[PDB]
A paper describes a structure:
Here, we show how hPol I can be exclusively purified from a modified human cell line in its natural form and determine the structure of its non-crosslinked apo form by single-particle electron cryo-microscopy (cryo-EM). The cryo-EM reconstruction of hPol I shows connected density for the common hPol subunits RPABC1-5, the RPAC1/2 dimer, the N-terminal domain of subunit RPA12, and most parts of subunit RPA2, with exception of the C-terminal clamp and anchor domains (residues 1,010–1,134). A C-terminal extension of subunit RPA34 specific to the human enzyme is flexible in the cryo-EM reconstruction whereas the assembly of RPAC1/2 reflects the conformation known in hPol III and tightly interacts with subunit RPA2. In our reconstruction, weak density for the stalk subcomplex, the clamp and dock domains of subunit RPA1 indicate increased shelf module flexibility but could also originate from technical drawbacks of freezing or sample preparation. This allows an unambiguous placement of the domain without adjustment, indicating that the hPol I foot insertion indeed resembles a built-in HMG box.
Human RNA polymerase (hPol) I has a single target gene, the 47S ribosomal RNA precursor (pre-rRNA), from which the 5.8S, 18S, and 28S rRNA are processed. Hence, dysregulation of hPol I is associated with pathologies, such as cancer and developmental diseases, for example, Treacher Collins Syndrome. The composition of hPol I is similar to yeast Pol I of which detailed crystal structures are known.
Numbering used by the authors:
A (entry chain I): 16 to 62
B (entry chain B): 4 to 735
C (entry chain N): 9 to 113
D (entry chain M): 22 to 143
E (entry chain A): 837 to 885
F (entry chain A): 935 to 983
G (entry chain A): 1230 to 1362, 1495 to 1622
The structure:
Amino acid sequence: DLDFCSDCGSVLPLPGAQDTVTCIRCGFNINVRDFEGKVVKTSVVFH
Amino acid sequence: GSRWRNLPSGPSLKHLTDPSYGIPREQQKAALQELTRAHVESFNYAVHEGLGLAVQAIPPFEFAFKDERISFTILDAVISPPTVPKGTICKEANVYPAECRGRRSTYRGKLTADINWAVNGISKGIIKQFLGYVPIMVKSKLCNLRNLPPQALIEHHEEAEEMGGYFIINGIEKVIRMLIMPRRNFPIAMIRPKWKTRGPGYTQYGVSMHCVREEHSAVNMNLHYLENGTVMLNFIYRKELFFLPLGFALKALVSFSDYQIFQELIKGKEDDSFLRNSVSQMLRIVMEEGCSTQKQVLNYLGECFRVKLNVPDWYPNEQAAEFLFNQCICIHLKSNTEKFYMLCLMTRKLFALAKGECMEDNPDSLVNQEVLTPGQLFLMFLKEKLEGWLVSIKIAFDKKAQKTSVSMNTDNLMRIFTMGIDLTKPFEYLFATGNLRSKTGLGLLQDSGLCVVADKLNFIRYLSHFRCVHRGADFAKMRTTTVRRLLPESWGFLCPVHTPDGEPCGLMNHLTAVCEVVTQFVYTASIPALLCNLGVTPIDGAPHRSYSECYPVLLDGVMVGWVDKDLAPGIADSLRHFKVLREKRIPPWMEVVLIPMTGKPSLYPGLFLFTTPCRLVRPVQNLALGKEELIGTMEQIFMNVAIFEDEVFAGVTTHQELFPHSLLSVIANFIPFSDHNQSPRNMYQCQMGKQTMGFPLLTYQDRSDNKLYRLQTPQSPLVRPSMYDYYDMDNY
Amino acid sequence: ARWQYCGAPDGSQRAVLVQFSNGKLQSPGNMRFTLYENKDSTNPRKRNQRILAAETDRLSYVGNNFGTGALKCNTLCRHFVGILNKTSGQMEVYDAELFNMQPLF
Amino acid sequence: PPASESPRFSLEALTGPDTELWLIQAPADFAPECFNGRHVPLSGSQIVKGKLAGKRHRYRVLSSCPQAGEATLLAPSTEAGGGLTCASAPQGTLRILEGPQQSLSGSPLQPIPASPPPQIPP
Amino acid sequence: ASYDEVRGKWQDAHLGKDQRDFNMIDLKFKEEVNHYSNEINKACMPFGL
Amino acid sequence: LPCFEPYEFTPRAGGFVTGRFLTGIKPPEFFFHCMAGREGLVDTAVKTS
Amino acid sequence: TFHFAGRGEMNVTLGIPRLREILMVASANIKTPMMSVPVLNTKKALKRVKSLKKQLTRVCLGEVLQKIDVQESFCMEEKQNKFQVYQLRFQFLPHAYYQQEKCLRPEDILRFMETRFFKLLMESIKKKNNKASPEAMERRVQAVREIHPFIDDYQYDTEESLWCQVTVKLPLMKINFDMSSLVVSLAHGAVIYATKGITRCLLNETTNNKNEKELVLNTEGINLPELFKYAEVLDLRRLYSNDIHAIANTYGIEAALRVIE
């Protein structure tokens, strides 16, 4: 779930803030309220 | 295989009583002679072509003062067969070894160099320097006995059946022993607790790789695996271990904007949701420090390291970074993009390990262990030692502005070239003792007992002494039995009854009788096209079925693409054909191992090829095509080998061992009725027989050796094993 | 499939294709491309050099047919284009050129 | 500089739903003219015997719909002043390979004589 | 069971990636076969020397 | 050992030598035997010291 | 030449080190204090002795946990784009399995789970940031949130008692750690209930061809004062330790000898 490609150059830094998310390279900013990437995790590993 | 097409069928004595006993033959014996192909073959290739590609990597060096860019370099260097200092009138200005033994002196060589005196850019001079001497392995392409027939031998009073391969330092005969080091250019997994404690958040896991170049110096890699989620690189240069996260390397390598990196280092496990997060996390924690573009990260790394790397304070901060990068990371490749893909495949394996999809490949078998020849050690010691001569000439030139004398710019070359930095002493030392007084471990972990004096008290002593791998003197005080118990795979590449019981028991093995180390390099020229003009898809193309199921195809240090589920066995069989028929530049020395996907924790899947030197290999017969075939250590584990004819089952088996006698070494093949005996007796005798006292040798006037035990009236023994003749032992 | 070969309509331009090594982009109906032909029409190592540099707002992609930065297939596997007409059932075959792209900072 | 190719390349030409776009791969040397007037499978793999200036060459070809849209065709645009734009996803891919000629599995097996019983006493 | 019963084959296989189950089958097999030795070296010496 | 199919069921794949010292042991079983001898002598020497 | 003796019965330090610690060290130092314990061969003894075994076992947390499941992201819709949340579930092994062995019930142990896990997790978050520096169940869970505001929710779903699901939220300033595995690094560390010192007590048969069939059980660990509470289903007269020091202070020195020998 990397913030993928339309305008920036790099990995878009984490939301991790109060405002909407820029880039470092070109500065193309996008809405902080877009991402809903839902993560799943570990499992049966204990017997 | 054709070499063993003439074994005797039951010995005889017809040959002790013929009119021809006594008159020297013309073609000296074949087998006995090739019994030491490896030693002289390597040293052969060393000095005639090895320091060819091994002087074209010493860095241009001299920088002394006055804004000068003098960069004097070696154009060529060579060695010439050993002649005599000009005698009063020496009739023949050549020296033969038999002379060197009598007078307790060495058997040397002549070293020459071509330095170009580029005066801040090529201006002046190419001065030849007489560096020093070097010893010469007898009967290489550098000793006067090169290519002589037997009579020309006995007239020189050297014994008729010479095999050579030793050096002569003051009469003694020293031999370099073959050691063992891991596989060449391979990502071998590993687990170990001792790693845990080097810093914070180290797990036990990781991968490894031993990388060696043409100009044979070596480097050792390591990628740990953090629990946090990041992956590191832990290498060492010039005796100090270094630290570097993965982000800096995968940015500094190729400009190649990162989403490339992510989408490529993620091959088809898209379902994961911790892997990709760890990936993105790396990519961020490398971005927000001081750097955005490629030159930027280079700038940063150089600014950090040029304090330790000790480059000239002339150069910019990025040049030193780049200099460092391609001197200690994935050397064998000599490019960048392939350095990238190598790092990629390494980490993919490391992950699929730590998550537990594969099985931890043993780093202790013979499936992952090969052999160092004396040529390697020799050449690499030499190439290290040249640098020291350059830097010493530097201080020799600095003594000028130090003594505040005339710090000259040119026409002082001759004088400033005699410092007293010769190469005699450092080489006489390495052999005189066996010690390795040096500055680089050259991949090795030890430095002593490297060449030990071959005795002459018998003929069995010699005939073994030249066929003896050993695993390094450091593994002796250890108590674990796992370093001695014969793994069931070493069948055919080591001898089970020949270990020298005592203190260095179990380790100081000897080779089998049907294995030959590989020492002829090939032109790796047209094989990738050959791969790709079949099913193999290009490396970064659009692979028609490119996802979780597809095999990488490494090539002795080169990614070449991917193959899919249907093809891999078809490709492996086709290359089987095109080796055995020996058709199109496909060497016979080649291994074609494909490891299928078990769906279960097992060996890492793949399909691997090699051509590199220094590997064990032994012939077998094929039941598909009549011809005989060569098998590498790695690809026995997936073959069916029928020992006797009575076993051969149609459709399931493929090979047929040549003769059953293979398993044993040669010495342990001179024992009679040896499957009846009990094993510890076999071993006791293979130790004993070397101790005995029989007919050592003919010329009792050549050698002033110290102790020669002789037995007046020896006799041929009546009950004999076939291989007593095939080596014509009866002369001794 | 009726197989008809036409060669190249001009002889110096095949069917140009663009494969980005980073997946599949979303609205490539917005992009403009830059084809580069080496003007030294004599030297067969330079007469044929093509640089497929792709200006995009996020990634400065570039494609080529040379070096370790190209696909060996362009040098070891030819590429064609098949134009199959569903009406009369004919495949139109030209020469086609693949190029692999890399985004420069 | 984008020039003027066949009007069968303009993106206005390929948008026909009755026309198909197909990407093909053949090794460095496959000369196309042999296939002329020949048939190529549209799904599955069929060995063909091509005649390139009389010589009989045989090739096994792959015919299947691609992994989803691996790449795009650039097609001359009339509105974009020659600036090249993307086409649709091609309807299929063709891999072409010369099927190995005269290769059996290996053979029937081969025997060896048996030594053991030697001369018994004189 | 067949002589290479794909079932038993796969079982022995997967457990080969463990220690304790493999040791269980090890010991069982051992003390299974070790009652042909007592019928070899007993119907033999010292009754037919 | 590189002579048998993976995961056979003959006890030969174990250590069940059958021949004796008056008729000869076959080629394969000659290897296992040596393994055992080596392990034994090692344990002896170490426990002695 | 390796022994063929030993049931699998916690064999203790072999070889010279035992000799050294007896003559050359003489320290407490013991690796496995396997005490000896006979049952005074009464009649009933059974309904008492097996319950005794059970209650003198020791079960920790890391034995009974079977699965962990996390779903951790996305916190923007909870009224505002705020501290990142964690969806979380535990799966144990079915009550029938352990229930026969350990004398345990899945509900009160769940109570201990909710009781301790949460002060525990607060400890764990604390140390991480330092190193980086039913209406009854309703009142339970809302007090959880009370004495720990960070803890948003808790749901012991009542039917199964074989699966629990919580839901948390803490600030997104600190960077994520092995959370999915910090549940694991705090699982093992916990022990539910255990007598002081002793862990392992087992039960087997005596010997008759040796002596008069005095049935024995097999304990491990030295806390003599505790053994007395069971006073009527064992033989506290023929009772010697493997330690040479646990009995030293409880019985004497003439006590020590026979056991030394």
